[PDB]
Design an enzyme around this catalytic site. Sequence first.
Site, PDB file in Angstrom:
ATOM      1  N   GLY B   5       2.403  -2.908  13.243  1.00  0.00           N
ATOM      2  CA  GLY B   5       1.163  -3.477  13.737  1.00  0.00           C
ATOM      3  C   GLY B   5       1.046  -3.369  15.241  1.00  0.00           C
ATOM      4  N   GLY B   6       0.180  -4.201  15.821  1.00  0.00           N
ATOM      5  CA  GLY B   6      -0.019  -4.204  17.262  1.00  0.00           C
ATOM      6  C   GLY B   6       1.265  -4.449  18.032  1.00  0.00           C
ATOM      7  N   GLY B 242       0.228  28.058  38.624  1.00  0.00           N
ATOM      8  CA  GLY B 242       0.133  26.610  38.707  1.00  0.00           C
ATOM      9  C   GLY B 242       1.436  25.903  38.383  1.00  0.00           C
ATOM     10  N   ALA B 243       2.237  26.502  37.507  1.00  0.00           N
ATOM     11  CA  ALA B 243       3.523  25.919  37.141  1.00  0.00           C
ATOM     12  C   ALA B 243       4.318  25.638  38.411  1.00  0.00           C
ATOM     13  CB  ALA B 243       4.288  26.868  36.238  1.00  0.00           C
TER      14      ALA B 243
HETATM   15  C1  LIG Z   1      -1.107  -7.518  15.499  1.00  0.00           C
HETATM   16  C2  LIG Z   1      -0.269  -7.803  14.251  1.00  0.00           C
HETATM   17  C3  LIG Z   1      -0.671  -6.861  13.112  1.00  0.00           C
HETATM   18  O1  LIG Z   1      -0.694  -5.645  13.286  1.00  0.00           O
HETATM   19  S1  LIG Z   1      -1.128  -7.517  11.554  1.00  0.00           S
HETATM   20  C4  LIG Z   1       0.478  -8.153  10.950  1.00  0.00           C
HETATM   21  C5  LIG Z   1       1.362  -7.075  10.324  1.00  0.00           C
HETATM   22  N1  LIG Z   1       2.567  -7.717   9.781  1.00  0.00           N
HETATM   23  C6  LIG Z   1       2.862  -7.704   8.484  1.00  0.00           C
HETATM   24  O2  LIG Z   1       2.149  -7.150   7.648  1.00  0.00           O
HETATM   25  C7  LIG Z   1       4.032  -8.322   8.058  1.00  0.00           C
HETATM   26  C8  LIG Z   1       4.618  -9.369   8.764  1.00  0.00           C
HETATM   27  N2  LIG Z   1       5.731  -9.986   8.400  1.00  0.00           N
HETATM   28  C9  LIG Z   1       6.490  -9.737   7.333  1.00  0.00           C
HETATM   29  O3  LIG Z   1       7.513 -10.374   7.084  1.00  0.00           O
HETATM   30  C10 LIG Z   1       6.055  -8.607   6.393  1.00  0.00           C
HETATM   31  O4  LIG Z   1       7.165  -7.748   6.118  1.00  0.00           O
HETATM   32  C11 LIG Z   1       5.464  -9.128   5.080  1.00  0.00           C
HETATM   33  C12 LIG Z   1       4.893  -7.952   4.285  1.00  0.00           C
HETATM   34  C13 LIG Z   1       4.336 -10.120   5.372  1.00  0.00           C
HETATM   35  C14 LIG Z   1       6.542  -9.824   4.246  1.00  0.00           C
HETATM   36  O5  LIG Z   1       6.044 -10.168   2.948  1.00  0.00           O
HETATM   37  P1  LIG Z   1       7.059 -10.630   1.783  1.00  0.00           P
HETATM   38  O6  LIG Z   1       8.349 -11.039   2.384  1.00  0.00           O
HETATM   39  O7  LIG Z   1       7.081  -9.543   0.774  1.00  0.00           O
HETATM   40  O8  LIG Z   1       6.329 -11.918   1.137  1.00  0.00           O
HETATM   41  P2  LIG Z   1       6.057 -13.164   2.121  1.00  0.00           P
HETATM   42  O9  LIG Z   1       6.503 -13.043   3.533  1.00  0.00           O
HETATM   43  O10 LIG Z   1       4.969 -12.129   1.546  1.00  0.00           O
HETATM   44  O11 LIG Z   1       6.078 -14.650   1.479  1.00  0.00           O
HETATM   45  C15 LIG Z   1       7.340 -15.248   1.152  1.00  0.00           C
HETATM   46  C16 LIG Z   1       8.026 -15.862   2.379  1.00  0.00           C
HETATM   47  O12 LIG Z   1       7.945 -14.924   3.470  1.00  0.00           O
HETATM   48  C17 LIG Z   1       7.592 -15.700   4.627  1.00  0.00           C
HETATM   49  N3  LIG Z   1       7.100 -14.842   5.732  1.00  0.00           N
HETATM   50  C18 LIG Z   1       7.862 -14.312   6.683  1.00  0.00           C
HETATM   51  N4  LIG Z   1       7.111 -13.603   7.523  1.00  0.00           N
HETATM   52  C19 LIG Z   1       5.852 -13.685   7.101  1.00  0.00           C
HETATM   53  C20 LIG Z   1       4.639 -13.185   7.559  1.00  0.00           C
HETATM   54  N5  LIG Z   1       4.595 -12.439   8.659  1.00  0.00           N
HETATM   55  N6  LIG Z   1       3.515 -13.472   6.887  1.00  0.00           N
HETATM   56  C21 LIG Z   1       3.539 -14.224   5.799  1.00  0.00           C
HETATM   57  N7  LIG Z   1       4.677 -14.715   5.337  1.00  0.00           N
HETATM   58  C22 LIG Z   1       5.841 -14.468   5.958  1.00  0.00           C
HETATM   59  C23 LIG Z   1       6.509 -16.613   4.054  1.00  0.00           C
HETATM   60  O13 LIG Z   1       6.279 -17.690   4.964  1.00  0.00           O
HETATM   61  C24 LIG Z   1       7.286 -17.123   2.841  1.00  0.00           C
HETATM   62  O14 LIG Z   1       8.230 -18.117   3.248  1.00  0.00           O
HETATM   63  P3  LIG Z   1       7.922 -19.684   3.025  1.00  0.00           P
HETATM   64  O15 LIG Z   1       7.611 -20.007   1.614  1.00  0.00           O
HETATM   65  O16 LIG Z   1       6.712 -20.056   4.022  1.00  0.00           O
HETATM   66  O17 LIG Z   1       9.222 -20.473   3.555  1.00  0.00           O
HETATM   67  O1  LIG Z   2      -8.386   0.157  10.117  1.00  0.00           O
HETATM   68  C1  LIG Z   2      -8.345  -0.279   8.964  1.00  0.00           C
HETATM   69  O2  LIG Z   2      -9.313  -0.879   8.500  1.00  0.00           O
HETATM   70  C2  LIG Z   2      -7.098  -0.072   8.114  1.00  0.00           C
HETATM   71  C3  LIG Z   2      -5.983  -1.114   8.364  1.00  0.00           C
HETATM   72  C4  LIG Z   2      -4.785  -0.498   9.088  1.00  0.00           C
HETATM   73  C5  LIG Z   2      -4.764  -0.792  10.573  1.00  0.00           C
HETATM   74  C6  LIG Z   2      -3.470  -1.447  11.090  1.00  0.00           C
HETATM   75  S1  LIG Z   2      -3.015  -3.133  10.299  1.00  0.00           S
HETATM   76  C7  LIG Z   2      -1.767  -3.355  11.726  1.00  0.00           C
HETATM   77  C8  LIG Z   2      -2.482  -2.722  12.952  1.00  0.00           C
HETATM   78  N1  LIG Z   2      -3.297  -3.880  13.595  1.00  0.00           N
HETATM   79  C9  LIG Z   2      -4.538  -3.651  13.612  1.00  0.00           C
HETATM   80  O3  LIG Z   2      -5.518  -4.352  14.051  1.00  0.00           O
HETATM   81  N2  LIG Z   2      -4.910  -2.375  13.036  1.00  0.00           N
HETATM   82  C10 LIG Z   2      -3.578  -1.741  12.594  1.00  0.00           C
HETATM   83  O1  LIG Z   3       3.809  31.271  30.375  1.00  0.00           O
HETATM   84  C1  LIG Z   3       3.608  32.487  30.450  1.00  0.00           C
HETATM   85  O2  LIG Z   3       4.505  33.238  30.833  1.00  0.00           O
HETATM   86  C2  LIG Z   3       2.249  33.060  30.065  1.00  0.00           C
HETATM   87  C3  LIG Z   3       1.186  32.956  31.182  1.00  0.00           C
HETATM   88  C4  LIG Z   3       0.120  31.911  30.849  1.00  0.00           C
HETATM   89  C5  LIG Z   3       0.266  30.622  31.633  1.00  0.00           C
HETATM   90  C6  LIG Z   3      -0.902  30.304  32.594  1.00  0.00           C
HETATM   91  S1  LIG Z   3      -1.336  31.674  33.867  1.00  0.00           S
HETATM   92  C7  LIG Z   3      -2.362  30.356  34.793  1.00  0.00           C
HETATM   93  C8  LIG Z   3      -1.533  29.052  34.626  1.00  0.00           C
HETATM   94  N1  LIG Z   3      -0.545  29.030  35.831  1.00  0.00           N
HETATM   95  C9  LIG Z   3       0.668  29.037  35.468  1.00  0.00           C
HETATM   96  O3  LIG Z   3       1.755  29.026  36.152  1.00  0.00           O
HETATM   97  N2  LIG Z   3       0.852  29.062  34.032  1.00  0.00           N
HETATM   98  C10 LIG Z   3      -0.573  29.072  33.451  1.00  0.00           C
END
Ligand SMILES: CCC(=O)SCCNC(=O)CCNC(=O)[C@@H](O)C(C)(C)COP(=O)(O)OP(=O)(O)OC[C@H]1O[C@@H](n2cnc3c(N)ncnc32)[C@H](O)[C@@H]1OP(=O)(O)O
Ligand SMILES: O=C(O)CCCC[C@@H]1SC[C@@H]2NC(=O)N[C@@H]21
Ligand SMILES: O=C(O)CCCC[C@@H]1SC[C@@H]2NC(=O)N[C@@H]21
Lengths: 168, 353, 176, 176
Positions: B5-6, B242-243
């Site tokens: 994720g992020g 340029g290199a």
């Molecule tokens: C900016 C952030 C982003 O991009 S969006 C967030 C992306 N993160 C995730 O998808 C996962 C985060 N954390 C993880 O642990 C993941 O691996 C996930 C998939 C959520 C783990 O799931 P899984 O272990 O299969 O089921 P569970 O966690 O589904 O539920 C059972 C116990 O796990 C715990 N857990 C621990 N971490 C998390 C979490 N991040 N989210 C939800 N639950 C989590 C749950 O709390 C639960 O424990 P308990 O019953 O509360 O004691």
């Molecule tokens: O873009 C979508 O709708 C598909 C979901 C996948 C995007 C991933 S989820 C973790 C990470 N955090 C975000 O906000 N986007 C990516």
């Molecule tokens: O890498 C090579 O030997 C092929 C030549 C192409 C690369 C271009 S020529 C203009 C520019 N200046 C450089 O030193 N490299 C690129």
Amino acid sequence: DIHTTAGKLADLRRRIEEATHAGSARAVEKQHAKGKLTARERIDLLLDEGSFVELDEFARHRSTNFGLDANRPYGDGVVTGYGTVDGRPVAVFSQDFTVFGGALGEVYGQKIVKVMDFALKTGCPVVGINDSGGARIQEGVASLGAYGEIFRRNTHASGVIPQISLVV
Amino acid sequence: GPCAGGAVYSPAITDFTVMVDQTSHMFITGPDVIKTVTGEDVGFEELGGARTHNSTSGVAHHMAGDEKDAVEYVKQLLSYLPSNNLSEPPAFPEEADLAVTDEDAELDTIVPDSANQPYDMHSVIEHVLDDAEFFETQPLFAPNILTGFGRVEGRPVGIVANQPMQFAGCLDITASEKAARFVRTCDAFNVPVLTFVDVPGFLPGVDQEHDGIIRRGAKLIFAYAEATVPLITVITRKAFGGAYDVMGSKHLGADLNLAWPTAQIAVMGAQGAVNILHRRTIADAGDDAEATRARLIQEYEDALLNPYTAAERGYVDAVIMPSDTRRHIVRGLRQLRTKRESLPPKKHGNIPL
Amino acid sequence: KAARFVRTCDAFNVPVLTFVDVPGFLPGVDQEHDGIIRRGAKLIFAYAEATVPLITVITRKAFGGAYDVMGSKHLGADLNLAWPTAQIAVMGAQGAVNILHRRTIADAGDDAEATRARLIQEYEDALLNPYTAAERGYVDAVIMPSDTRRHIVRGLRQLRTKRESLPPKKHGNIPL
Amino acid sequence: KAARFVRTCDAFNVPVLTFVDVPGFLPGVDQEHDGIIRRGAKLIFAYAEATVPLITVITRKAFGGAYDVMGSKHLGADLNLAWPTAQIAVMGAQGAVNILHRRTIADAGDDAEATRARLIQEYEDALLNPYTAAERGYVDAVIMPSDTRRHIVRGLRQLRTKRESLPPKKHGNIPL
Ligand SMILES: CCC(=O)SCCNC(=O)CCNC(=O)[C@@H](O)C(C)(C)COP(=O)(O)OP(=O)(O)OC[C@H]1O[C@@H](n2cnc3c(N)ncnc32)[C@H](O)[C@@H]1OP(=O)(O)O
Ligand SMILES: O=C(O)CCCC[C@@H]1SC[C@@H]2NC(=O)N[C@@H]21
Ligand SMILES: O=C(O)CCCC[C@@H]1SC[C@@H]2NC(=O)N[C@@H]21
Ligand SMILES: O=C(O)CCCC[C@@H]1SC[C@@H]2NC(=O)N[C@@H]21
């Protein structure tokens, strides 16, 4: 050879010899007769043994005025570089009278600017060893430009880094 | 371990990221989502494993075989950097012996006669660094360029060098971005940067253009031009177009630019040059079309394919014997360590992204 | 694209207005392999670095890290507004329930769905809005869409005198 | 006289306009013995030090070091204009030829002059102008005398926002 690596090294050695002996033998002879030392002998006296690092040793003028391009000596009339004096950093230039009468030219002047920029940049003293007949007339106004750039540096560096002028 | 994720964006911002092979994974989106959205069926390892991020994405800086080694790597990384940007990197001063050693001598013959026969730039780097110790970063990413840390007289330095063994040392998108970030990293933390050049140019390819080599390759020039730490560049062989400008040239702000006798600093190759400069001369005399241009090519290369024109203009501060490289770098850094330079005032730059 | 534009505006003292409606990042192996991690991080860097006035309006979707990236208050945004149609949540309802109720749904193989379907429905009606974020102050206000212009105008009037600066440095080390 | 006036203007942010027409320095043993070397250098120091806008106009003569001294571009002048009547050269034609053609003139004791006289004439018609300097960019433009006012007005408009500074120091060490 020349197309081989070893040949290029041997080639460099030859140019080094030519550069370190830019002025003619008779020119050097005339210099010594006037009770004057050569540009490089003066630098050897100033800097600590083995500390000298020459810059633009193979520099050459780019003028074609009044058949100047007939002779393009390495260094272009001035020896420059950096080293240490009593273990402390120092920048230096030494005008070579045996080359074009030590007349200041474009490249010649640019070499002095480089040493001055180095001294200002690193914050070290500048020792200028002067021995020039004047401006290299063939290069016309180009020599005046060089002088000007130097004057400007002299002023900007004034009170910033020590500047000593050795006039020999 | 996992970083999904992020969350991945935090390490992305940090200066260095070290992963563990078959034990750590980074990814913004999991296999399950991409599967149902793109139809692509990929496993965690392939998607964002240590190797993937160290040799494909260019996000990770190192892949260790285990956690112990990973921790050791970070300790090494820290040993080359200061505690903050207000201090020089940690140093352990020791005057080096600048006498020409048998090792230094080896450099005079490291460059083969054949401009084609490659050599390992690693050897060059090791010959100038203390204890021949080179700490490489991102070894598996953009192998055509080398980045890492070392020490000169006990003082940490950074290294950027083209690798003739990969893509003939040519630059490309990945190498440009790899080296660019490293240089900026060193500069921000007051680490001097030593660069070794041997680049024939940029890697040709429609993909390179379409993927934005223009804005991405520019990142490296920006890096060098921005840097205020000591900069010493050594051109061991090729340096075309340029290199040449990109690889820490003096025009960008390099403080000391050295070139070996084997250096080739020119606008472009002999063939490409002659075909333009003599396109009309060669056009004539269809008889012996070749040999007439092969001669022109021979003249051009023997006349310009060297570092002497650059030396004449002062583009390179000196043409040195390879064996004197260590001497130059050592004495150069001694004077450059007090380098004080600054850029025009600004909130920040606008480097190409 | 956005990262460099934001930095450009910031370098030249140009205020930045951001309108958010992002479900997340475009899934794909290519995105990962091409370095979305270091390249996508460029946008958060731009926003966190910016010292010019920053006003953000979330018109609809804002999930996961995408929410953080789009000029969130956590990055330094000065004024963050959200429309009633905004959905600020850690992730989509479906993805969230499959985790939070993984066990509660596992029960009874029969009636597998409809149970999580209902759960998904309950989750979105309860969390897929901007009010939890508003309670925490992540958004400074939940506004009527028609009042956006009024908020931006009055906001910029006060923010124009904004003075902020980052720690001293030669420069940053933005991902490349 | 000029050196202190220039510094005065600079210290009080007053732009300086310079009009050049100088053949060189006034010959004389007294000038040398009275220290023209250190006293004349005061003018170049003033100009090189100045950070206020600097516009220079060469109306005619500008030879040797005098050219450098009179607010030349090499010292930091921002805008350097020259009239068609300007003569920017390293030295006078006569002095230049006696050197460049010292050998060519030595030949034939007879026809001694007329040969160098012609050479002097050729040298002045070829180099005693502002075009070589213009080719090098030493002067930003060769203008019609009547366009001087226009150039100064437009130049100052752009240069008024000039921002420049010398290396940090307690003060300089101008010759005394
Ligand atoms: C900016 C952030 C982003 O991009 S969006 C967030 C992306 N993160 C995730 O998808 C996962 C985060 N954390 C993880 O642990 C993941 O691996 C996930 C998939 C959520 C783990 O799931 P899984 O272990 O299969 O089921 P569970 O966690 O589904 O539920 C059972 C116990 O796990 C715990 N857990 C621990 N971490 C998390 C979490 N991040 N989210 C939800 N639950 C989590 C749950 O709390 C639960 O424990 P308990 O019953 O509360 O004691
Ligand atoms: O873009 C979508 O709708 C598909 C979901 C996948 C995007 C991933 S989820 C973790 C990470 N955090 C975000 O906000 N986007 C990516
Ligand atoms: O890498 C090579 O030997 C092929 C030549 C192409 C690369 C271009 S020529 C203009 C520019 N200046 C450089 O030193 N490299 C690129
Ligand atoms: O002023 C004159 O016309 C006489 C010529 C002597 C002046 C000398 S020549 C070297 C130095 N450089 C100059 O511009 N003027 C003096």
